[PDB]
Amino acid sequence: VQLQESGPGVVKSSETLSLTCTVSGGSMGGTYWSWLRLSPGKGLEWIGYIFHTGHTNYNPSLEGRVSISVDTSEDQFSLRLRSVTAADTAVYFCASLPRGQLVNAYFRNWGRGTLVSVTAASTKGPSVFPLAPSSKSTSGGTAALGCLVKDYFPEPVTVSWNSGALTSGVHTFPAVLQSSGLYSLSSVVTVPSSSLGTQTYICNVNHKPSNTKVDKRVEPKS
Amino acid sequence: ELTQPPSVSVSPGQTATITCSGDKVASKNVCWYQVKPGQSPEVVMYENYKRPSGIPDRFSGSKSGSTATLTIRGTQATDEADYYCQVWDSFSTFVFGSGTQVTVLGQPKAAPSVTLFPPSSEELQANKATLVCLISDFYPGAVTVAWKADSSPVKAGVETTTPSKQSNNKYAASSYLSLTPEQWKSHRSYSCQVTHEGSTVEKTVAPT
């Protein structure tokens, strides 16, 4: 017996997530067919379960926001989670429960796990801010100056430095999905701090999804 | 809630003990799941000490109580995972642990480098403020970020990432703190605080 789920990769905020889950190598009866999810900040949690008869049991914490459908015809069971917020961003699994006494029970036959992110619906251009040179950087040398690419959607964003003529000492950090629904990454380069004031540093940000290209010049403070 | 030690690290030889120590904890029955990224979670212990089908002998543990413990002897590399404990509840049906990250080196532990950037003047001219905390070169990849305004902790407007493997075989992560310029300018100092293993690094910036 396998278990494989599916659903949209992305869900726009305050809508209604909708997933389905397909069983293979067996039949539906005799087991509570459950939905769960996993994310840091909330840990692992049981969303709900359904029986092939149509009868359900949900998580109180959710509840009135969750609807679990079912289909005995085509070995599937569906999830429907309305009024979605940033907290609902998680890795969603479907699993199985041996029908019986539930104290001793545990989930078996988990699925691979879909991955749902709560976003902002519309394509957004990034704001590019300079991160003025500082020190605590990899010794001296030596300073670390960067670029903050804030509030963009969707991914990806490309940050090069001085049009690519600069590769050594470049650390571009992975983005952050925010409660906003918008991404945000930072790209910092480490340069000889003897070269400040004279050598020019520009981060070249490309966000093809919005056809935006920002070349931000990073000056030292004064 | 059922509290668990956020991270547990162990050399490939030694053993690892994980605790679930909540409130009920749980008058008898406890179960443990192993979770690896992009993989289907699976059981490794149930009731208290029972080992399911396909579980090597090194997995073990039981309640004291009131506290269940999962113990892995001679810890193998494929045992690197996130472990969660679970009990039945009268009302909630199922109550899960906070999760523990069992990392299992790997390589010698690396201490995190923290780099804190204050808001740019430009961003402040756009009526936004964002403090950037960049953490890099740390092993294992399990840290804890906490923000401080002056001395008071901060929970609002904080967005931290999941640590990512680097080319250095080490981990990197960022944390962002969002503020209104008024907030930024009104306080005396803000501080990014990074706890990795037992050690912490607290960087601090101030409005000037």
Short mmCIF file of C-alpha atoms in Angstrom, two decimals, chain A residues 22-184:
data_model
loop_
_atom_site.label_atom_id
_atom_site.label_comp_id
_atom_site.label_asym_id
_atom_site.label_seq_id
_atom_site.Cartn_x
_atom_site.Cartn_y
_atom_site.Cartn_z
CA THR A 22 -4.53 9.13 -3.71
CA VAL A 23 -4.20 5.63 -2.25
CA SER A 24 -2.84 2.66 -4.21
CA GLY A 25 -2.35 -1.04 -3.46
CA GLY A 26 -5.51 -1.47 -1.42
CA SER A 27 -9.02 -0.35 -0.52
CA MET A 28 -10.37 2.45 1.68
CA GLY A 29 -12.22 0.75 4.53
CA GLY A 30 -10.87 -0.17 7.95
CA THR A 31 -8.62 2.87 8.30
CA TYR A 32 -9.03 6.53 9.26
CA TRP A 33 -7.61 8.47 6.32
CA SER A 34 -5.91 11.50 7.80
CA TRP A 35 -4.44 14.87 6.86
CA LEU A 36 -1.46 16.36 8.68
CA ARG A 37 1.04 19.18 8.18
CA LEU A 38 4.56 20.09 9.27
CA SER A 39 6.28 23.45 9.66
CA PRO A 40 8.70 25.07 12.09
CA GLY A 41 6.95 27.49 14.44
CA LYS A 42 4.06 25.05 14.84
CA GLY A 43 5.89 21.73 14.65
CA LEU A 44 4.03 18.68 13.38
CA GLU A 45 0.25 18.70 13.73
CA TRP A 46 -2.75 16.53 12.91
CA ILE A 47 -5.24 18.37 10.69
CA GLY A 48 -7.96 15.75 10.62
CA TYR A 49 -9.21 12.40 9.37
CA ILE A 50 -12.11 10.87 7.48
CA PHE A 51 -13.73 7.44 7.27
CA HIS A 52 -14.99 5.95 3.99
CA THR A 53 -18.55 6.40 5.28
CA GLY A 54 -18.17 10.17 5.10
CA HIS A 55 -17.63 10.74 8.81
CA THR A 56 -14.88 13.07 9.96
CA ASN A 57 -12.85 14.23 12.94
CA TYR A 58 -11.03 17.56 12.82
CA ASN A 59 -8.48 19.40 14.94
CA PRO A 60 -10.17 21.91 17.31
CA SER A 61 -7.36 24.44 16.78
CA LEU A 62 -8.38 24.51 13.13
CA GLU A 63 -12.09 23.61 12.86
CA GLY A 64 -14.72 25.60 10.96
CA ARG A 65 -11.83 26.42 8.66
CA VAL A 66 -11.30 22.82 7.58
CA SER A 67 -13.37 20.55 5.35
CA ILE A 68 -12.33 17.01 4.43
CA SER A 69 -14.08 15.36 1.48
CA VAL A 70 -13.80 11.76 0.27
CA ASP A 71 -14.31 9.43 -2.69
CA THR A 72 -14.60 5.64 -2.42
CA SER A 73 -15.01 5.35 -6.20
CA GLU A 74 -11.53 6.62 -7.00
CA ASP A 75 -9.36 5.77 -3.98
CA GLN A 76 -8.88 9.37 -2.83
CA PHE A 77 -9.53 11.80 0.01
CA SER A 78 -9.51 15.59 -0.23
CA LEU A 79 -8.67 18.51 2.08
CA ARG A 80 -10.13 22.02 1.99
CA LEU A 81 -8.68 24.73 4.25
CA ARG A 82 -10.32 28.16 3.84
CA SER A 83 -9.40 31.65 5.07
CA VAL A 84 -5.70 30.83 4.74
CA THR A 85 -2.97 32.87 6.49
CA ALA A 86 0.84 32.96 6.75
CA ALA A 87 0.81 30.29 9.47
CA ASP A 88 -0.76 27.78 7.08
CA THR A 89 2.46 27.72 5.03
CA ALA A 90 3.60 24.13 5.56
CA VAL A 91 4.49 20.68 4.22
CA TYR A 92 1.18 18.83 3.94
CA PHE A 93 1.00 15.05 4.36
CA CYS A 94 -1.77 12.49 4.15
CA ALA A 95 -1.54 9.36 6.28
CA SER A 96 -3.42 6.33 7.61
CA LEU A 97 -4.71 5.19 10.99
CA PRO A 98 -5.62 1.63 12.02
CA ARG A 99 -9.30 1.94 12.90
CA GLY A 100 -9.71 1.10 16.58
CA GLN A 101 -8.66 2.30 20.02
CA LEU A 102 -6.77 5.55 19.41
CA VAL A 103 -4.51 5.89 22.48
CA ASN A 104 -2.10 3.19 21.28
CA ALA A 105 -2.57 4.09 17.61
CA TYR A 106 -0.08 5.78 15.30
CA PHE A 107 0.03 7.02 11.70
CA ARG A 108 1.41 4.69 9.04
CA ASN A 109 1.72 4.83 5.25
CA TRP A 110 2.54 8.55 5.10
CA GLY A 111 2.72 10.28 1.74
CA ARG A 112 5.72 12.04 0.22
CA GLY A 113 4.33 15.42 1.22
CA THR A 114 3.18 18.39 -0.83
CA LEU A 115 4.51 21.84 0.01
CA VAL A 116 2.15 24.81 0.24
CA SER A 117 3.19 28.46 0.54
CA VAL A 118 0.84 31.34 1.31
CA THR A 119 1.69 34.22 -1.01
CA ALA A 120 0.54 37.64 -2.23
CA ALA A 121 -1.16 36.73 -5.54
CA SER A 122 0.34 39.48 -7.71
CA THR A 123 3.79 39.89 -9.30
CA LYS A 124 5.78 42.46 -7.32
CA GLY A 125 8.95 44.34 -8.22
CA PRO A 126 11.80 44.21 -5.68
CA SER A 127 13.03 47.18 -3.67
CA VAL A 128 16.83 47.28 -3.65
CA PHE A 129 18.62 48.81 -0.66
CA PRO A 130 22.35 49.17 -0.04
CA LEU A 131 24.04 47.58 2.97
CA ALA A 132 26.91 49.91 3.86
CA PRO A 133 30.32 48.31 4.64
CA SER A 134 30.99 47.18 8.21
CA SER A 135 33.54 45.07 10.06
CA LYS A 136 33.44 41.81 11.99
CA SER A 137 33.84 40.41 8.50
CA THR A 138 36.40 37.73 7.66
CA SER A 139 39.26 39.62 9.37
CA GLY A 140 41.05 42.56 7.81
CA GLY A 141 41.42 43.36 5.02
CA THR A 142 38.35 43.62 4.94
CA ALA A 143 34.73 44.77 4.95
CA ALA A 144 31.36 43.28 4.12
CA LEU A 145 29.00 45.37 1.99
CA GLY A 146 25.74 44.11 0.56
CA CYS A 147 22.36 44.54 -1.06
CA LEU A 148 18.98 43.94 0.52
CA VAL A 149 16.43 42.84 -2.05
CA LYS A 150 13.17 43.40 -0.17
CA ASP A 151 9.52 42.63 -0.98
CA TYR A 152 9.46 40.82 -4.33
CA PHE A 153 7.30 38.10 -5.85
CA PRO A 154 7.75 35.62 -7.16
CA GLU A 155 11.18 34.02 -7.07
CA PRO A 156 13.80 33.83 -8.47
CA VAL A 157 15.98 36.92 -8.15
CA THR A 158 19.54 37.07 -9.51
CA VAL A 159 22.18 39.14 -7.72
CA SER A 160 25.55 39.52 -9.41
CA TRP A 161 28.30 41.94 -8.38
CA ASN A 162 29.96 44.59 -10.54
CA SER A 163 28.34 42.95 -13.58
CA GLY A 164 29.93 39.60 -12.75
CA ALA A 165 33.51 40.89 -12.74
CA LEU A 166 33.41 40.02 -9.03
CA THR A 167 32.99 36.39 -7.96
CA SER A 168 35.37 35.84 -5.03
CA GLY A 169 33.88 36.73 -1.66
CA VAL A 170 30.24 36.68 -2.74
CA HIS A 171 27.59 35.21 -0.44
CA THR A 172 23.98 35.45 -1.61
CA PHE A 173 21.58 34.28 1.09
CA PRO A 174 18.37 32.34 0.32
CA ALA A 175 15.15 34.38 0.31
CA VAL A 176 12.54 34.72 3.05
CA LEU A 177 8.84 34.13 2.59
CA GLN A 178 7.32 36.77 4.85
CA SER A 179 3.94 37.22 6.52
CA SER A 180 3.63 39.85 3.80
CA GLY A 181 3.58 37.06 1.23
CA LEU A 182 6.60 38.66 -0.40
CA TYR A 183 10.15 37.30 -0.64
CA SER A 184 13.33 39.05 0.52
#
